[PDB]
Design an enzyme around this catalytic site. Sequence first.
Site, PDB file in Angstrom:
ATOM      1  CB  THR A 131      -0.901   0.050   1.268  1.00  0.00           C
ATOM      2  OG1 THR A 131      -0.094  -0.011   2.446  1.00  0.00           O
ATOM      3  CG2 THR A 131      -1.902  -1.079   1.304  1.00  0.00           C
TER       4      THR A 131
ATOM      5  CG  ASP B  66       6.666   1.406  -0.890  1.00  0.00           C
ATOM      6  OD1 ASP B  66       7.720   1.713  -0.324  1.00  0.00           O
ATOM      7  OD2 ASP B  66       6.559   1.364  -2.134  1.00  0.00           O
TER       8      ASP B  66
ATOM      9  CD  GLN C 148      10.084   1.937 -11.553  1.00  0.00           C
ATOM     10  OE1 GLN C 148      11.320   1.944 -11.375  1.00  0.00           O
ATOM     11  NE2 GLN C 148       9.217   1.479 -10.643  1.00  0.00           N
TER      12      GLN C 148
ATOM     13  CE  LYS D  93      10.453   3.692  -1.871  1.00  0.00           C
ATOM     14  NZ  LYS D  93       9.130   3.058  -2.173  1.00  0.00           N
TER      15      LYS D  93
ATOM     16  CG  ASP E  88      12.418  12.678   9.878  1.00  0.00           C
ATOM     17  OD1 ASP E  88      13.331  13.191  10.553  1.00  0.00           O
ATOM     18  OD2 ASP E  88      11.532  13.371   9.312  1.00  0.00           O
TER      19      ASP E  88
END
Lengths: 257, 257
Positions: free
Chosen positions: B60, B90, B208, B92, B95
């Site tokens: 997701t 997802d 991509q 990512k 921080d």
Amino acid sequence: MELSFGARAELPRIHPVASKLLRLMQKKETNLCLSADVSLARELLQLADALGPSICMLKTHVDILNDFTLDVMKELITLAKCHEFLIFEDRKFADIGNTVKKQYEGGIFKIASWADLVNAHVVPGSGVVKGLQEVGLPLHRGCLLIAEMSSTGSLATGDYTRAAVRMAEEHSEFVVGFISGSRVSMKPEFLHLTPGVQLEAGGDNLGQQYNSPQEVIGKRGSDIIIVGRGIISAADRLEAAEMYRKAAWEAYLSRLG
Amino acid sequence: MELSFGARAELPRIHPVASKLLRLMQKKETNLCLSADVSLARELLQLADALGPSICMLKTHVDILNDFTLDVMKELITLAKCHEFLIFEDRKFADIGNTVKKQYEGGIFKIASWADLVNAHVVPGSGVVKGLQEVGLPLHRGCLLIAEMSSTGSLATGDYTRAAVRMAEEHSEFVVGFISGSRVSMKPEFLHLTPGVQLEAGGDNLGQQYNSPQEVIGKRGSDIIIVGRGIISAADRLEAAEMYRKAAWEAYLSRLG
Ligand SMILES: [Cl-]
Ligand SMILES: [Cl-]
């Protein structure tokens, strides 16, 4: 050699968002960005109102607000316009271009609709900037690239940092500067914002490391300090903000000479 | 030498989330992860139901769902349990440790409450993992570290990739594998998931780049393909999912020998 914030605001290649920021920094004698790291909308807005006059920028993490609504962001914008500061959502976009464009414009947060500035990691390659730009340029927004990080074990060093600077230069219509620990570009049109700042030495138990405003602005040549717990955890957040503002501003004046 | 997914599920140092995944991969003959890149909850849930039997995992991006609610995630979990797949957000994370812990547990999304797996960039240093772990270990969750990216100009190469592998090894109680383009660890307890996958050659206009299931699983030694537009943009998403499943599964069997 070195120009004041007000003169930098007029540079030929300055981005309009950078110019607006630099002008209000000069006008208000502040190069302090408040990291408004709270989980309640009411506390966010109360901090924004009280500390608005002392700051050039208010940095959010909208994804930690327990009671986020777009109406909260409307109220923040009202305060931003009243007190004259920019809103910077510290989203650290870090996905492929096609994905970050959706994350920036859409979903529940609609970040691009209220954030003057966002930031991005450069690790995916320049597609991260190109994707964000597709949304941010039409909306007259700016972006900061993360060239260095304050945290222990940061891999944003050496050639990685150099790549972030190149990416910024090559996308100057949208990229207005850097998150960094020091000056990384010699071009005065770019802003340098530095987190990991407190008056006292130290760090936290999850890799954060601190340096002082004098060190960061005066010696390392950055423009703006980003201060979170140094202000937020203090009893009197207004006094704390004023202490950090005065520290950062005088460090700037001294290096200007 | 090389072990089947079902045998890897029993390895002494296997993480429980990895074990559950590896077992259902073997049972269902699927090493396909669906990248459910849609903006409508109803489409997400309809894809999850129809394609559930063909996938080991549904990935997701909750922050692009225009009508996200926690009730939507409840319904996704029901489908995940029914059809037997894990949910991977997802996000990512990228921080400092103190911030990612809040972004993982809190805010509107409460990611840790419904995501079996999340991922993280390693650029901040190991604090990113330590912060996530503080929330994820008590909740019996797993994390994937982004060791390589598929996109043009990726800086996740060389020493950066090596640092991600080291970080994973040193945090094996929480880190269950990698997002990567190829096998990057020789330890069979770690999963390798690879995005940037289509049957046909090509890419998009935002960096991509595509490689085939045979290339990624067969030649580059990854475990699971992550497929988005190759399925989502097809007319018949079920047939498309089956094509990618069969491709990835046979590539796996052949390299197993
Ligand atoms: Cl930061
Ligand atoms: Cl990806």
